[PDB]
């Protein structure tokens, strides 16, 4: 059912409203996703000036429905089965020895485009830390997103660790706690334990004058 909205290239739209340690900001993004390949290409722009935090801290926040689930795992794809009505995605993202983000998002189709609309609140960030200190390198590592079914909420939970490369050669962990809930009341797939294996490359648009990020990502379900 929901899965058939993803047999081809789908336009994507991202919108975020944020507040980190009281600094407010906005971001708009556009691109396309092709779940056949688990492939995503997105470009984001800070519509409110300079970004208060490093672009990479926001990658996970800015569409797991574009994950490639292999044939033998199609029945474990909660993300697509909740479409077109979509889901709510909430996270606590805790940065080791520093602040946290709490985020809330709706992911759903609006006409022929997949839209991800987010609210983010950050607190307790050290003014001289890796985040507000802008000490993260402009790149992104490759991770496993571990998914589990949450029958009580008719959805799923995920847990994972993002490794942010720090300019001084160290690594800043960001622990991700995640909950997804369908928006429609119809049937959804509740999957067995599995994970998503992700790889992301960050780059810049040479002709872009605004503060921005270009993201290329590949996501593939595995573990069954």
């Amino acid at each position, epitope marked *: 059912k929901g899965e058939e909205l993803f047999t081809g290239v789908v336009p994507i739209l991202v919108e975020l409203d944020g507040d980190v340690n009281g600094h407010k900001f906005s971001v708009s993004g556009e691109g396309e996703g092709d779940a056949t390949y688990g492939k995503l290409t997105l470009k984001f722009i800070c519509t409110t000036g300079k970004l208060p935090v490093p672009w990479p801290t926001l990658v996970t926040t800015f569409v797991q429905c574009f994950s490639r689930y292999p044939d033998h795992m199609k029945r474990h794809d909660f993300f697509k089965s909740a479409m077109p009505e979509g889901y709510v995605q909430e996270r606590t993202i805790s940065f080791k020895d520093d602040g946290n983000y709490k985020t809330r998002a709706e992911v759903k189709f609006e006409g022929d485009t997949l839209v991800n609309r987010i609210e983010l609140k950050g607190i307790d960030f050290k003014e001289d830390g890796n985040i507000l200190g802008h000490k993260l390198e402009y*790149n992104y590592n490759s991770h496993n997103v571990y998914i589990t079914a949450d029958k009580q909420k008719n959805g799923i939970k995920a847990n994972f660790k993002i490794r942010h490369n*720090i300019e*001084d*050669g*160290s*690594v800043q962990l960001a622990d991700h706690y995640q909950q997804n809930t369908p928006i429609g009341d119809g049937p959804v797939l509740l999957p067995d334990n599995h994970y998503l294996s992700t*790889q*992301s*490359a960050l780059s810049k648009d040479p002709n872009e004058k605004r503060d921005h990020m270009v993201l290329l990502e590949f996501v593939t379900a595995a573990g069954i």
Partner: nanobody
Amino acid sequence: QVQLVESGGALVQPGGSLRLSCAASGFPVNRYSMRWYRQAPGKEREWVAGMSSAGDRSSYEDSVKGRFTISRDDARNTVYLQMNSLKPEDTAVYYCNVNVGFEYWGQGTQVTVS
């Protein structure tokens, strides 16, 4: 064409010293930060050490501070991990790491401290 290859792993007695090498191909070691991780069986793969791209800063995880030194020879495009005061707790497969568009790992080298 980006490749990393670790070497140097071996059996070593506690207290001993050992040096690991990470040979890099496909990119210049002096244009990218590089890192060592390790993974003991059972446990998760933890970050061990790193050096900035410019070379001006090095960092370590608390449990190896003052015992390990990371360095690099730019000309040989190689990164090293000098280990001293080896503890049996240091037993693990060691990996080096770089991000060049995407993240790359070497295949790892086994260090056994017994």
